Every structure is written in C-alpha cells, then in structure tokens.
Ligand binder design. Structure first.
Ligand SMILES: [K+]
Ligand SMILES: [K+]
Ligand SMILES: [K+]
Ligand SMILES: [Mg+2]
Ligand SMILES: [Mg+2]
Ligand SMILES: [Mg+2]
Ligand SMILES: [Mg+2]
Ligand SMILES: [Mg+2]
Ligand SMILES: [Mg+2]
Ligand SMILES: [Mg+2]
Ligand SMILES: [Mg+2]
Ligand SMILES: [Mg+2]
Ligand SMILES: [Mg+2]
Ligand SMILES: [Mg+2]
Ligand SMILES: [Mg+2]
Ligand SMILES: [Mg+2]
Ligand SMILES: [Mg+2]
Ligand code: NA
Length: 63
RNA sequence: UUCGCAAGAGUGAAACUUAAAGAAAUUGACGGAAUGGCACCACAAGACGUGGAGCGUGCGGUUUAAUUUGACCAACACGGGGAACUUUACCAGAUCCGGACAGGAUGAGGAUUGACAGAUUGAGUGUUCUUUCUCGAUUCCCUGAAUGGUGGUGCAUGGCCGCUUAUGGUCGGUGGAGUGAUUUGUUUGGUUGAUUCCGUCAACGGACGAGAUCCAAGCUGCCCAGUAGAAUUCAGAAUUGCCC
RNA sequence: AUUUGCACAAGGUGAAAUUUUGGGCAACAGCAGGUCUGUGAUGCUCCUCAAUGUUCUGGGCGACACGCGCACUACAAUGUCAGUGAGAACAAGAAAAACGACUCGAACCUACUUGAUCAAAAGAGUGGGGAAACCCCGGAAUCACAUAGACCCACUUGGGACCGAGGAUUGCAAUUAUUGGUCGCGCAACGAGGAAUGUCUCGUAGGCGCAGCUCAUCAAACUGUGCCGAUUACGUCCCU
C-alpha cells in the first residue's frame, strides 16, 4: 500500500509552430542566441518571465 | 450333545474379516555368536589441551521494519562468508527499462531526448509539476512475447565436491556347479599396509584398484654464475701488553 | 621359520634401512548428502514498468535475560618488567584501446634521510626494485645474558576485560568506538578448571613467530614457512 499519489511519467509538450515564434521581407530572431561558441548559431536561449536559459549548455542569464 | 469329581476331553459351526499367510533355498544387512587381522578420525603408555574465566568468531534462541539465507561422524573461523557504502540476496523509500522484435495508432504543420530557475523531495535527484528552450525519427502510445532475476524446486538436472571408505576392494569372457536367484574364479595355510605374494585348487585366461607413475625433502655427478659466493696478494686504516 | 617358498627380526653398509619421509592421484557400487548464493550450466514454474529486473539514499546482516561448537589471552617466579646479544625460511610487490607529456610518468612494495634545538603514531622528500638484482648481510621471537638490574608468592609490577579524554591515519562516507598511537580505568572475572571430550609416534606433540590470503582500512581465521624442541609406545582388540 502506498500513501503518496502516483507520479505520472513526463510527457514532452509542444507549440506546433515553435519555429515561427522564434523569428519575425525582413527576418529578426526574437530569441537571443547562445553566446557559448560550442552551441553556436541555431541554438536560442529561452525566454522565461524570470531569466534566459539555453537548452544545450544550460546557461542562465538572470534578469 | 456324550464322557469327567473337577480341570477339562470328544464332536464341532456360523456371522464377520482378510490378499496374503506360509515353505525351502539365494544375496545383502544385522547379532549383548564364533575365527583371523587392522586403525592414535580406537584403546593401552603418555603429552598438550577443550569442558571452568574474560574475550574473538560461527550456530541457535530472543528481539526487530529487517536482524537475507545454505548446511544440524559427514552442520556450527564452513559457503574461501574478516559484510561501513558496493558486495546484498533482507527492510523503508525513490529512479531507469537494460519490454529486443512484430502488429496497430500519433508522427519533421514534429515521434521523442535532456534540462536552468522556483516548488515537490532524503536528494543543489527535470523523479514529478510552472516555464519554456534543447535533441531530432534513435523513441513514445496499445496488444502480443520477450528480457532479466544471489525468485522457487539440489526430491527434475549437468558439472563439481563431500561421504560410505583409508581400508583392500571390484568386474567380465569361456569353462565347471545349481530348475533358479546365484556360485566358482575371488581359496583352507603362511606372508604383506595391501585380493601383496608363495603355495593349493573346476578352472583358466584377462581388466581395473593396490603397487608402479608423479611432486617435494634429505646425500651426490655434470653444468654454471657482472642477479651466488669464496680464497689469496698488494694498498689504506684500527687494536697492540705493565694493567686482573 | 625352514619339506620348500613367500618372508620376518636384530645388526652391518650407508646421507638415508624399509611402501626411505611427506603428499598428490586413486577402482566398482552407491547417498533422493551439498551446491539452482560461481558461471552466458540448466528443465519446469513465479515476478516482469509504483518489478522479485536494475540503480540510488538510508538502515540491517554486528542488535542481547540466554544455550552450544571452534579459537585467542590468562591464572604467574621453568615468571612479569627494563636492558643487551646472537640469530630463519616460505613468500609478495606498480595499470588500461585511460589520463598527462611525447613510445615514457603515476598507482605497488621498500631502503635512506628529515621531521628533530625534543613523545608515539604521523607527515614529507631522495633513491631502488618487474623481483636471486631494491627491500637484503632479509638483525622474527621462542632463546641467551657472571645484566653482579627491579619485583618476592600477593588477585601482586600476574591478567588485561571493560570504560574516559587527546591526537593521527584509510575511505566518497568511521555514529553502532574502522584501525593504529598517548595518558588514564584495572576494584572484570580468573589462583589450573566436575561429569564428559579432541589430536597426536620424530624434527613429531607442544611452544614461537613470519609470509601469503582475504584486503582502500581491519586477523583471535585459513593456506604455507621456518625456529626451540620433548614424554611415551613401537603393543592390543578391552572401548569405538
Ligand atoms: K547348467
Ligand atoms: K563397494
Ligand atoms: K593503554
Ligand atoms: Mg472342547
Ligand atoms: Mg599401529
Ligand atoms: Mg569417517
Ligand atoms: Mg568448518
Ligand atoms: Mg543499498
Ligand atoms: Mg542467475
Ligand atoms: Mg542431492
Ligand atoms: Mg548433483
Ligand atoms: Mg564370487
Ligand atoms: Mg600382518
Ligand atoms: Mg591375505
Ligand atoms: Mg553473518
Ligand atoms: Mg602486566
Ligand atoms: Mg574465513
Ligand atoms: Na533453475
């Protein structure tokens, strides 16, 4: 017998057009690129309401 | 019912129950039955102990969430088992899939992987949520069947080990004897640790085991040493005579 | 003892005199002996995604009124301390398709020196060794000492169990003391052990250490090794 609720398995979410919202004829990238040279271009830092985050190298820029 | 003084004797069922009971021989095993041998896992002559104390360790019991389990001469410092984590098989929790593959959904208008921060939490563990980034077709979702398991069953097994069993034991062929199971060979005697030999003989011929082989140790030959040593010369240095 | 034969007993010879000594191997039949906890040995069966798989965290396998088997230490003067001497043998020792340099280095063992103008245990350097090469002339302790040393028959300078404080080391982690080292505790029993019971015949028993093994750390275990070394019998079938 267990008392804690069962932990669900993590499912990946999606935006279904996530590349469109990164860019903005003239094209501008709405996401600041990763300054880390290893990640390079094409890796965009996340835009959280608190800080910026890189998916590859986990670099974090606090506001 | 007859006989008897009586004890009883003669005569003599059935109901019911039961698959054997018996008989003679054979091979084992056993004997508080004989005979001959043998062993310090036996004794004799003894020696050191153990059993008494403290402590180490293993086993049991008790306790515990768990105190994981096997083994009870031939279990108990034994599983090479002297476990802090691991080991670990037990207990309280928490991850991962290491469910290949096949079939069917979703699916690059994205199947999926991994994560900073703040919460969850034992965890500064993305284990889960909020949040979005990231990786891209490796996964994920469902059914089947696979996989792994110090899960069971050693009374399903292999292999290995222990023990019977440290003694001298074991088996055919052909021949003899019995209806046969079986027996002789494989033996009365002496000898040997020895079914070891010598003799004897309804046997003769063999095959294992014992012995032999093998490994060390003690004596020794050859060979050999800038990875072993020795002796002898010079050269240096030390003691040097009255001392008690 | 002997018709013979097979042999035996003493003594010679000899390093060795009867399976030379000690081991290894060891038949045929078996046992419902043990092992499914060695294996990618294995049949059947059980679990299999909040798993009996796997990993991680923490506990446990060590818990203690007790019983039992094995071992270690003792009960002291054939002694305990303190000092000095002479003196073994088996043995072990370091690493990669990875880490740095560019094939070599480091892991392992050990010697020497310092620490040290002041305890041990440490900590550090400098070398050496792939092991007949370094350790190493392997300074083991039982032992010895005419050491003119202390103790003097007492649970005592026997015994060293239990426990308290300091400090060091191994490890990612030492609390349930990991293990050494220091000062205390010693007033914990134990003064030779009932009934029963184990092993042993010569370099043996007993006593004494040392190495390997398990091992990052830890031996009262085991597997070997050497050292000091006897009493007794060399017989029997009374017991098993
Ligand atoms: K016949
Ligand atoms: K037999
Ligand atoms: K002390
Ligand atoms: Mg009558
Ligand atoms: Mg005898
Ligand atoms: Mg026996
Ligand atoms: Mg044992
Ligand atoms: Mg664990
Ligand atoms: Mg298995
Ligand atoms: Mg069996
Ligand atoms: Mg078997
Ligand atoms: Mg016969
Ligand atoms: Mg005889
Ligand atoms: Mg005979
Ligand atoms: Mg145990
Ligand atoms: Mg003392
Ligand atoms: Mg052991
Ligand atoms: Na099985």
């Amino acid at each position: 017998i267990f008392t804690k609720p069962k932990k669900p398995t993590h499912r990946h979410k999606l935006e279904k057009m996530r590349a469109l919202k990164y860019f903005k004829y003239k094209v501008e990238r709405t996401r600041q690129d990763c300054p880390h040279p290893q990640c390079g271009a094409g890796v965009y830092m996340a835009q959280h309401k608190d800080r910026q985050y890189c998916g590859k190298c986990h670099l974090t820029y606090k506001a």
